[PDB]
Structure 1
Amino acid sequence: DIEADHVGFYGTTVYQSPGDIGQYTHEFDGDELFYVDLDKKKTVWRLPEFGQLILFEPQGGLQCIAAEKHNLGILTKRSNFTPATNEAPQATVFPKSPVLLGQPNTLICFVDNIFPPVINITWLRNSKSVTDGVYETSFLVNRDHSFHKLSYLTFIPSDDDIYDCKVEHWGLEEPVLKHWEP
């Protein structure tokens, strides 16, 4: 909607009740700079090189979470306790680079329309859990105030690649098992 050469989110915050779940992140041009590990009080850079000479004081994200906890209490009453609507998330999986037999690659599970921001994304190969080396982003903000998140699974393409991205969310009656079509 607002056009610009660049946009920084220097303050992306979400908090929810009950459950006392939240996150604090910064973004630049739609990519995550860091999140603040609230309980450990520390900045976790999306790529480790980001924080080599630049610091972000984690207290900033703690302040914002504290303010959002307070703000939620007010607005929840003001709304006459209107609850969030659980959305059905949408998953797509695609490779980072062109698939070539034997050549190292990464499967990316892109999960969109996430709301509230609580989800489990996991990977299966040959319908068996694979957790080694899996990485996932923080919740990244959407203009419509839902979220998306990506999970990553390193793999070596093979003859019969059978990979699935499993998404569990309160907005789903059954878990979505999203198959990767090579």
Structure 2
Amino acid sequence: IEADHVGFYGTTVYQSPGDIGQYTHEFDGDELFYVDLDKKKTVWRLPEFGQLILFEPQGGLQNIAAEKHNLGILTKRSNFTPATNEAPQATVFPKSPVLLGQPNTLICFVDNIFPPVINITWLRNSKSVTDGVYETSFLVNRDHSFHKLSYLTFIPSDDDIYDCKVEHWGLEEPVLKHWSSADLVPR
């Protein structure tokens, strides 16, 4: 609806096989934090925020327990209708103007993710680069699919080629989204 701002305050997700669940908060389309259901710690996207306000993890866990229960009930009520795998869409782009030799960050936006299970990875000159890499939580979409962001720090260079490997069940073979400082049409 018409709104000047919208806060997503209680967002929970649960998947049965594997007892996979997630809990987050967003404000105006941006992720506020997520709760480590393992460490039981409220982790902030902007760490400066948790310094001025705080969320009690039990609030999330309590919501995980609700959806876990509801999951079981709904599954049976549906006559065990399973989720339908969708095909994600990925797009790679730099946070700022790519300037040869100037430190930057590559961004990989993957959309239409469902179920909320996926593998986002980076390759430089065709080899995995686990390097100042970050990955958002599953950000919610209005059509009940999710989207995700992965980051790769790098210093622009014409002699390297970058790929964002996206693997999903709605995926036949790993999708490789290309990016090069020289405009490298597919490699």
> Structure 1-normalised TM-score?
0.97
What does residue 93 of structure 2 align with? Answer: 94
Q: CA deviation at 1:160?
A: 2.8
Q: CA deviation at 1:132?
A: 1.5
- 1:96-138 CA-to-partner distances (Å, cap 9, x unmatched) read 0011111111000000000111111000000010012100000
Give the SS at the match of 1:132: coil
Aligned equivalents of 1:146 and 1:63: distance in 2?
A: 23
- 1:60-118 CA-to-partner distances (Å, cap 9, x unmatched) read 11011000000111110011100000111110000000111111110000000001111
Q: CA deviation at 1:39?
A: 1.5
- 1:142-166 CA-to-partner distances (Å, cap 9, x unmatched) read 0000000000001111123310000
Q: CA deviation at 1:50?
A: 1.1
Give the SS at the match of 2:49: helix
Percent of pairs identical after alignment? Answer: 99
Give the SS at the match of 1:73: helix
Aligned equivalents of 2:65 and 2:39: distance in 1?
A: 15
Count residues with an aligned counterpart.
180
Q: CA deviation at 1:12?
A: 1.0
Aligned equivalents of 2:155 and 2:41: distance in 1?
A: 34
Q: CA deviation at 1:47?
A: 1.6
Q: Which runs of 5+ in 2 are unaligned?
A: 180-186
Tell me the C-alpha RMSD between the 2 structures: 1.1
| Displaced runs of 4 or more, over 4 A | none
